[PDB]
Design a protein around this ligand. Sequence first.
Ligand SMILES: [Ca+2]
Length: 234
Amino acid sequence: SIPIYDYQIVHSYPHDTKAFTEGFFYRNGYFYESTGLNGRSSIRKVDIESGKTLQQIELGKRYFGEGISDWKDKIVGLTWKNGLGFVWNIRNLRQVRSFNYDGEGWGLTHNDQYLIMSDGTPVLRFLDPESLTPVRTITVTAHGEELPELNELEWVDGEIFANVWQTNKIVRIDPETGKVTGIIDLNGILAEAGPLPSPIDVLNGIAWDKEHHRLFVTGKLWPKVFEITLTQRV
Ligand SMILES: [Ca+2]
């Protein structure tokens, strides 16, 4: 009754196996990743093919960085427990503004009007990109059930794709109703990943290139980012 989708790997690119991926998006032929690298949080511009870093800033010691997303000429980023967000110039990564919000920050994406954030609960926040305060929320449900643990996000083709932390699934959420309209099953994808690092952590990170319709998924300490297409199951 809830349509399930299987992946096909189109390509697979090296990813930093030391990087706890907290936020991930695609822009300008580049990856942008919010990364934990030994308790320190950095934000990073990655070359897609090499997985190498082309540019980074570090967050201050007291912040744990989470979701990131572009917005026009900016990167917006969340913190885990600080209630503080940042706005950077996407070009030189110089901090430009801070803002406050309640609760935790996990994932962050955007559609044409709004920044969209998760925080591990079933409740997604739509933010005014200007005031940076919520104007709508939706509650996320799968077969009528509240779906908590919503993590990294990505707006894909009219929908919110969200990692569900500690599963290998991605949910497609109708932004209007908050209903899960679809489930992407990435179980076993790691078997396709080449030799695994020690340690390795969980699926998390979805980026999308609107122009070419390319979907990229990764995860914390993963050795690959995967470009994937979807096929609806049987
Ligand atoms: Ca994302």
